[PDB]
Each structure stands twice: as C-alpha cells, then as structure tokens.
Amino acid sequence: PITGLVYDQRMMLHHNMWDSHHPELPQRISRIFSRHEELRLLSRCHRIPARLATEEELALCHSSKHISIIKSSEHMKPRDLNRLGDEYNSIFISNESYTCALLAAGSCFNSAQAILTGQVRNAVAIVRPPGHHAEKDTACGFCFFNTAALTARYAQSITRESLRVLIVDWDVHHGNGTQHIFEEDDSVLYISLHRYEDGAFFPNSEDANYDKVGLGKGRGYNVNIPWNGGKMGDPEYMAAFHHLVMPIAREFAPELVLVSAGFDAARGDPLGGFQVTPEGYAHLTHQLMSLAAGRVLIILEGGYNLTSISESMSMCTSMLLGDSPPSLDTPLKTSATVSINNVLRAHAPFWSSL
Numbered sequence: 641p642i643t644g645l646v647y648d649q650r651m652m653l654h655h656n657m658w659d660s661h662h663p664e665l666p667q668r669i670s671r672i673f674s675r676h677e678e679l680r681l682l683s684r685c686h687r688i689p690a691r692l693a694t695e696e697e698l699a700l701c702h703s704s705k706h707i708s709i710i711k712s713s714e715h716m717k718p719r720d721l722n723r724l725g726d727e728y729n730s731i732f733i734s735n736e737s738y739t740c741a742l743l744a745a746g747s748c749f750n751s752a753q754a755i756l757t758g759q760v761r762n763a764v765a766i767v768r769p770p771g772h773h774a775e776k777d778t779a780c781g782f783c784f785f786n787t788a789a790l791t792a793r794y795a796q797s798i799t800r801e802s803l804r805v806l807i808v809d810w811d812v813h814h815g816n817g818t819q820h821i822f823e824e825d826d827s828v829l830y831i832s833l834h835r836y837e838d839g840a841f842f843p844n845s846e847d848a849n850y851d852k853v854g855l856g857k858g859r860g861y862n863v864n865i866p867w868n869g870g871k872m873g874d875p876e877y878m879a880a881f882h883h884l885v886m887p888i889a890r891e892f893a894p895e896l897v898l899v900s901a902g903f904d905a906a907r908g909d910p911l912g913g914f915q916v917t918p919e920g921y922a923h924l925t926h927q928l929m930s931l932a933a934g935r936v937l938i939i940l941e942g943g944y945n946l947t948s949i950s951e952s953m954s955m956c957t958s959m960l961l962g963d964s965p966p967s968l969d970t971p972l973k974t975s976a977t978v979s980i981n982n983v984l985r986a987h988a989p990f991w992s993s994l
C-alpha cells in the first residue's frame with residue numbers, strides 16, 4: 641500500500657524572461673514539494689525518479705511538426721523565443737522549456753508504470769509546465785505537450801491498446817487539448833469540470849459545452865460539466881461528482897485513473913474565481929480512489945495561488961496515503977443545478993446509471 645511521488649527541481653528552469661511575475665511560476669512546484677516536507681508527507685511516499693520523455697513517446701499524441709518546433713526552441717536566442725511564443729495563444733518559452741516539458745511527461749510515464757506494475761498503489765506528480773491545453777499540433781495556454789493524454793497512451797502501450805483510462809480534469813479550465821485528442825476514442829473517457837460562462841472563460845470555445853459528447857466510436861466518452869454564473873465551490877463539485885462523475889466512471893470501469901489536477905478552482909486563486917477548499921479536493925480524491933482498484937495518478941495542471949495549490953495538492957496526497965477525509969463545511973447555486981441537469985440529459989443515452 642505505497643504512494644509514489646515524483647518531483648524534480650529541474651522543472652523550475654522553464655521561466656518567463658520578460659514577465660518574471662507571470663503566474664505560471666517556477667516556484668509553483670517547489671512550493672507544493674515544500675508543503676509535503678513540512679507536513680511530513682514526503683517521507684511516507686516512495687520517490688519515483690523523473691525522466692525525459694522520448695520523441696517517440698511524444699508522437700503518441702503530437703505531430704512531428706509540433707515536436708520539431710518546440711524542440712528547436714532549445715537553441716533559440718531571446719528575441720526569437722519571444723517571437724515564437726507570441727505565435728501561440730498564451731505561451732511563453734525559454735531555452736529550458738522543451739526539456740521541462742519532456743521531464744513533466746516522463747515523470748508521469750514513470751509514475752503510471754509504477755502503478756500499472758503494482759510497485760505503488762497510486763501516485764502524485766508535481767510537474768510543470770502543465771499539459772491539458774496542448775493540442776496534437778500546437779501549444780496553448782502555458783502547455784507544450786499534453787502530459788495527461790500522453791500518459792494515457794503510454795499506459796496503453798505497456799499494457800494493452802484498449803486499456804480503459806479515465807481522465808478527470810478538475811482544473812478550472814477546460815482541457816481543450818485532452819478532449820480533442822480523445823474525441824473519437826472509447827478507450828479513454830474524458831470528464832472535465834470547468835468554468836464556462838457561455839464560452840467567455842478561457843480557452844474561450846463552445847467546444848467546452850455539455851453537448852459535446854464525443855464523436856464516432858467516442859460518442860458518450862467525452863463528458864463536459866460546464867459552470868455558468870456562480871462562484872462554485874465544494875457543494876457544486878460534490879454534487880457533480882455524486883450525480884455525474886462517479887456513476888459514469890463506475891459504469892465505464894476504468895483500469896487506470898488520471899487526474900488532470902489543476903488547483904485553480906481553489907479558494908484564493910487569482911484567475912479561477914471559484915472557492916473549492918483543500919478539504920473539497922481531498923474528498924474528490926478520496927472518491928476517485930474507489931475506482932480502478934485504487935490506481936490513481938494525480939497530475940499537476942494549473943493553479944496559481946502558491947499557498948492554495950500547496951495546501952490543496954498536499955491534501956490529495958494525504959488521501960492517496962490512506963488518511964481519512966477531513967470534514968467539509970450549503971444549497972447549490974441555482975445555475976449549478978441547471979448545468980448538472982443539462983449534462984444528465986446529454987449523457988443518460990450513453991450511461992444507464994444516469
């Protein structure tokens with residue numbers, strides 16, 4: 641009954657050389673790691689080493705063109721880096737960015753391999769840059785390669801092609817890249833909760849709405865839970881898990897669970913505007929542990945209040961370690977009930993548990 645942890649200080653080297661106060665800070669990962677030490681959680685975990693993803697691994701989800709362009713940034717000069725970053729939606733690049741994105745992915749591959757071989761029951765990956773906005777052919781929203789998507793395909797590559805992987809994306813933003821990568825796939829169930837605001841919230845696309853249920857063989861295997869007009873918090877997230885995430889997940893019966901665990905829905909986040917508490921994230925983690933015989937990998941995505949993300953992700957690791965859930969502190973915001981009912985109607989054709 642062992643929990644893996646991967647963290648490598650080298651991933652701090654990715655930085656914004658024009659705006660050193662950009663919220664996707666190097667110290668996002670060192671702060672989370674530190675909170676694990678001062679809570680004495682780190683000594684309770686088995687440390688899993690980081691490694692570089694290979695280019696062949698990147699090709700599991702990304703085009704050769706995209707891989708070559710990001711790879712080339714390693715040797716670019718500052719003006720050329722600024723030029724190239726400005727060509728994407730919300731990207732900054734330094735000479736170390738490519739290596740850091742490689743390490744983030746390879747860290748998650750090693751963790752998934754530890755889980756699937758039974759060396760650990762579950763694991764946490766304290767990694768940056770994030771992944772879930774990255775598409776097959778382009779970088780986006782602070783993400784270069786789609787770490788969680790790659791890990792799902794890597795896992796299938798060391799087990800069997802049709803291994804059922806559930807990705808739960810509780811980052812406050814829609815994982816546009818993850819949805820698109822698996823949109824026609826019934827082996828990877830993608831469930832995202834996200835602030836939507838009728839398309840006004842980043843990444844600013846109606847792809848995130850509840851009626852995008854998947855395509856082709858994938859119809860039913862893409863579940864968008866979009867929030868509108870409300871400062872959502874633990875009550876809304878508990879209700880979404882009770883009515884939607886957990887029944888669908890149980891029916892799908894995943895063999896591996898990946899959490900795209902952004903902590904920007906947290907109370908205090910400067911961007912998310914939501915109020916999920918650390919005990920909220922602990923309860924969400926604890927519920928997912930009832931799936932896949934406990935085979936859960938928690939992957940850091942976004943989250944920009946250094947205190948909030950450090951407390952929030954430490955509480956997730958505490959639940960993976962088997963600690964009992966802390967106690968939560970209200971009626972759902974009326975628009976949250978609407979959102980949940982919209983998803984319920986959109987997916988009950990495909991999931992009899994709804």
Ligand SMILES: O=C(NO)c1c(F)c(F)c(F)c(F)c1F
Nearest residue numbers: 730781782811813842911942943
């Ligand atoms: O955290 C994010 N995504 O997970 C994120 C964000 F919070 C922003 F404010 C952005 F402008 C952006 F491009 C992003 F990708």
Ligand SMILES: [K+]
Nearest residue numbers: 809811813833
């Ligand atoms: K999300």
Ligand SMILES: [K+]
Nearest residue numbers: 822825828861
């Ligand atoms: K899918």
Ligand SMILES: [Zn+2]
Nearest residue numbers: 811813902942
């Ligand atoms: Zn986010």
